[PDB]
Structures are given as structure tokens and as C-alpha cells.
Amino acid sequence: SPAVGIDLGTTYSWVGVFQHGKVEIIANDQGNRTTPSYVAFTDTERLIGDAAKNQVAMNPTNTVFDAKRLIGRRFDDAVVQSDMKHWPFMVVNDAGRPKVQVEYKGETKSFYPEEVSSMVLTKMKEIAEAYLGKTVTNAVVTVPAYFNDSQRQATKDAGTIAGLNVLRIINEPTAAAIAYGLDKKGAERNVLIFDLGGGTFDVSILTIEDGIFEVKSTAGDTHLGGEDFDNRMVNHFIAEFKRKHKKDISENKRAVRRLRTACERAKRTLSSSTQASIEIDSLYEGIDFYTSITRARFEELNADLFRGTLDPVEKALRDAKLDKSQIHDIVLVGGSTRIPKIQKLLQDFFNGKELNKSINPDEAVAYGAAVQAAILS
Numbered sequence: 262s263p264a265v266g267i268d269l270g271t272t273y274s275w276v277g278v279f280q281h282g283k284v285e286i287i288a289n290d291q292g293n294r295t296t297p298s299y300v301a302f303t304d305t306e307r308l309i310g311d312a313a314k315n316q317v318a319m320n321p322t323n324t325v326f327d328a329k330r331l332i333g334r335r336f337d338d339a340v341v342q343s344d345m346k347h348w349p350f351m352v353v354n355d356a357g358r359p360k361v362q363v364e365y366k367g368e369t370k371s372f373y374p375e376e377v378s379s380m381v382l383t384k385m386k387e388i389a390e391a392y393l394g395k396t397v398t399n400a401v402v403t404v405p406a407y408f409n410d411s412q413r414q415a416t417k418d419a420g421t422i423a424g425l426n427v428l429r430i431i432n433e434p435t436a437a438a439i440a441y442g443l444d445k446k447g448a449e450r451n452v453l454i455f456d457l458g459g460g461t462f463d464v465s466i467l468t469i470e471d472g473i474f475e476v477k478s479t480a481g482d483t484h485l486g487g488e489d490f491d492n493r494m495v496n497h498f499i500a501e502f503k504r505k506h507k508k509d510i511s512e513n514k515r516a517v518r519r520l521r522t523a524c525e526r527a528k529r530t531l532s533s534s535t536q537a538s539i540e541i542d543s544l545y546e547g548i549d550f551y552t553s554i555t556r557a558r559f560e561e562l563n564a565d566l567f568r569g570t571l572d573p574v575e576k577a578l579r580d581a582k583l584d585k586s587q588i589h590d591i592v593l594v595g596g597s598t599r600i601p602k603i604q605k606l607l608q609d610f611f612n613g614k615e616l617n618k619s620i621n622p623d624e625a626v627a628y629g630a631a632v633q634a635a636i637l638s
């Protein structure tokens with residue numbers, strides 16, 4: 262039976278299958294290969310993915326995201342209490358365990374983090390069945406290497422709730438290394454995984470000896486990601502709109518959301534183009550917002566965030582007791598590592614060493630998990 266590899270991402274989720282000697286990162290029936298890790302609840306329906314993300318500004322308190330930051334954790338955990346101040350949805354305590362509380366079809370309902378993630382996994386399952394034309398049951402699901410047993414068990418539980426048979430929970434940096442065949446290359450191999458996603462930055466140093474993976478060190482920032490770079494763009498354009506129209510759009514949640522979406526899309530374009538256009542009809546009080554931004558300006562807006570990603574690299578190397586010259590392979594993971602300045606900074610830091618980046622970095626985890634799922638099935 263087909264077995265799939267699932268990257269259950271903090272902000273975006275991906276599903277691949279290894280067939281015929283190739284990995285297919287599977288598109289949904291609108292052609293999109295990624296599913297935002299969003300679930301929403303309304304008067305009439307439950308919405309997953311982009312359908313949930315697209316109505317977040319009209320339905321903020323019943324639109325849930327970031328379940329991966331809660332999954333496997335206890336309610337009184339410092340990080341849970343810290344994160345809850347930034348979320349517009351309610352997190353309640355059920356007997357020590359955090360639950361998200363929403364209104365759903367006119368009734369108050371609460372869900373464990375793994376139930377929320379299972380709804381995202383249900384969609385991934387359906388996407389893969391739409392592509393394969395067959396029932397999909399077996400899956401390998403990835404987690405951050407620092408996840409503990411509770412978080413791993415809760416992530417497996419989300420798979421089970423979704424109807425998946427989770428063959429194995431494996432680490433995201435190991436999935437990435439597997440995707441590049443780094444366990445099949447010789448002596449010990451020191452591998453640095455540089456994983457910059459939508460909300461989190463993870464650096465891992467693995468050593469692979471006789472095909473055995475050992476996590477030597479991890480570092481990073483749990484609250485640094487692409488959305489911070491989008492944030493800097495949003496603020497930049499809110500200030501521009503105010504300077505040009507003497508109007509502050511900050512308190513119109515729908516306007517800011519439309520600006521944010523435009524900024525995220527401009528950001529992606531700036532990874533392959535030196536400029537990007539912003540085109541928003543009726544952004545605020547009937548005023549269109551047609552403008553542009555250069556790649557240089559985007560880099561300037563974020564210069565300290567980009568440069569600072571090197572400090573967790575240095576720390577991970579110090580903890581692994583390796584010099585930078587002892588790294589055999591550098592692997593780029595997460596959508597944010599497509600940013601040319603981040604690539605330049607990292608390659609410069611490694612004295613010109615070529616990066617592993619031929620696999621779309623935001624897809625490399627699902628790619629590796631798909632390979633592992635075929636091996637185990």
C-alpha cells in the first residue's frame with residue numbers, strides 16, 4: 262500500500278510519496294503543494310488549510326493555528342503561558358492539559374492540540390488519496406529533533422485520530438538528511454541542518470556513522486521565522502501608507518491581513534526577482550495601494566534578523582565541539598532559506614562551501630519522510 266511522508270509544519274504542512282524512484286510532493290486539487298496548518302470553526306462548517314487561513318481576519322477567535330507549539334505540552338508550561346498572550350483564540354486548562362476553546366456551529370467546543378493537528382492531517386490524507394486514487398493509511402510524520410516523548414506521542418496520536426497508521430515519528434533534520442542521501446555516502450559525516458520556516462528557526466548538527474544518525478547539537482530560536490520578515494514589511498508599508506495618505510490602517514484587521522498577504526507574496530517573489538509589486542484594490546477608506554519593493558529594501562528591513570541567524574549556527578558548532586570546517590554537508594530546510602541573502606550569509610560563513618539546496622527547502626522534510634515511509638513499508 263502507498264505510504265506517505267508528512268511534514269506537519271508549524272505554519273505549513275506538506276505530504277510526499279516515493280513512487281517509481283521519484284518523490285512527488287503532492288498538490289491539492291487547486292494545484293497547491295502546501296496546506297497552512299490552520300483550522301477554523303464557523304456557524305456551519307469546519308475549514309482546513311487555506312480555506313481556514315483565508316477567513317482568519319473575519320473570524321479570529323475561532324481560527325486556530327500554531328497547534329504544534331501546544332502539542333504534547335501541559336497547560337502550566339512556561340512556553341504555553343507565554344504563547345497564549347499572542348493568540349486570538351482561547352486556550353483553557355482541562356485537568357492539566359491545554360485545550361483550544363472555540364465556538365462551532367453555535368456551540369462552545371474545546372479541542373486538544375492533537376485533535377487540531379489531526380484535522381490538518383485528515384486533509385493531507387485526503388490530498389494524497391486524491392492524487393493516488395487509492396486509500397492511504399501508512400505514514401511517517403516528522404517532528405523537531407528536540408521534541409520529547411510526550412510531544413512525539415501526541416503527534417502520533419494526531420495521526421491516529423486522522424485514521425493514519427503512523428509507522429514511525431522521525432526528526433525533521435534526519436528527514437532532511439535522508440532526502441539528500443547523506444546516510445548513504447565513507448567515514449563519519451558531520452551535517453548541519455539550517456531550518457528556517459514560517460515561525461521557527463532550527464539549527465541541528467547530526468553525525469552519521471555507518472548510516473546511524475546521532476543528533477550532536479541543536480540551537481535556534483523558537484520565535485523567529487518568515488512571518489517576522491513579513492511583519493517588518495507590513496510595518497514598512499503601514500508607515501508608507503500613512504506618509505502618503507495621512508491615514509493609519511493599523512486598526513482595520515482586514516486591511517492589515519490583506520497587506521500581510523501581499524507582503525508574504527512579495528517576499529517570495531523577491532527570492533527570485535530583484536523587485537516585487539504590491540497591488541491591493543481598496544486597501545483602506547476606498548484607497549488603492551499599488552506600490553513596489555526592491556530586494557535591497559527587503560534585505561535592509563530585515564538585516565539584523567538575517568545576520569543573527571549565524572549566532573545559533575556558531576552555538577550549535579560550539580556545542581558539537583566542531584569547527585565550521587569539519588561540517589561535511591550543509592542542508593537548507595524551510596521556506597525562508599530560499600532568501601538569497603540568507604544563503605549568501607550562510608555560504609560566506611562557511612567560507613564559500615556550497616549548500617545543499619537542490620530540493621525545494623520547504624519540501625525537503627516531507628521528501629525525506631516519504632523516502633523513509635517507503636523504506637518502512
Ligand SMILES: Nc1ncnc2c1ncn2[C@@H]1O[C@H](COP(=O)(O)OP(=O)(O)O)[C@@H](O)[C@H]1O
Pocket residue numbers: 269270271272273274457458459460461486487488525528529530532594595596597598599600622623
Ligand atoms: N520563495 C520564498 N522566499 C522566501 N520565503 C519563502 C519562500 N517560500 C516560502 N517561504 C516562507 O517559508 C515559511 C514557511 O516555511 P515552511 O517550511 O514551508 O513552513 P513551517 O513554518 O510550517 O516549517 C513562510 O514564512 C513562507 O513565507
Ligand SMILES: [Mg+2]
Pocket residue numbers: 268270271273458459594595596623626
Ligand atoms: Mg517547514
